[PDB]
């Protein structure tokens, strides 16, 4: 690793990922984790985050401009 940025997902990163996953589900994104009879995109997105199956990589910008790439599975939910 050797990265100053925290391995755990930041609260702001968690909010954006959940919003993005919910946005994809409403559009008609294929579900990595099957919904438990849920018509609400936000509810499915939270279960997908717990599963960590979401296909999202987050790029973190350092002051020097170095970029850190973290997979959703690698990131640890803040809550």
């Amino acid at each position: 690793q050797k990265r100053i940025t925290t391995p755990y997902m930041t609260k702001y990163e968690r909010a954006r990922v959940l919003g993005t996953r919910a946005l994809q589900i409403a559009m008609c994104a294929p579900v990595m984790v099957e919904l438990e009879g849920e018509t609400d995109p936000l509810l499915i997105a939270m279960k997908e985050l717990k599963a960590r199956k979401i296909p999202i990589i987050i790029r973190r910008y350092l002051p020097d401009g170095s970029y850190e790439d973290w997979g959703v599975d690698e990131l640890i939910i803040s809550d």
């Binding site: 968690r14 954006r16 919003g19 919910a22 997105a45």
Partner: peptide
């Protein structure tokens, strides 16, 4: 959807 999700978080 993104604004609603972040407001919830």
């Amino acid at each position: 959807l993104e604004t609603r999700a972040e407001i919830q978080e």
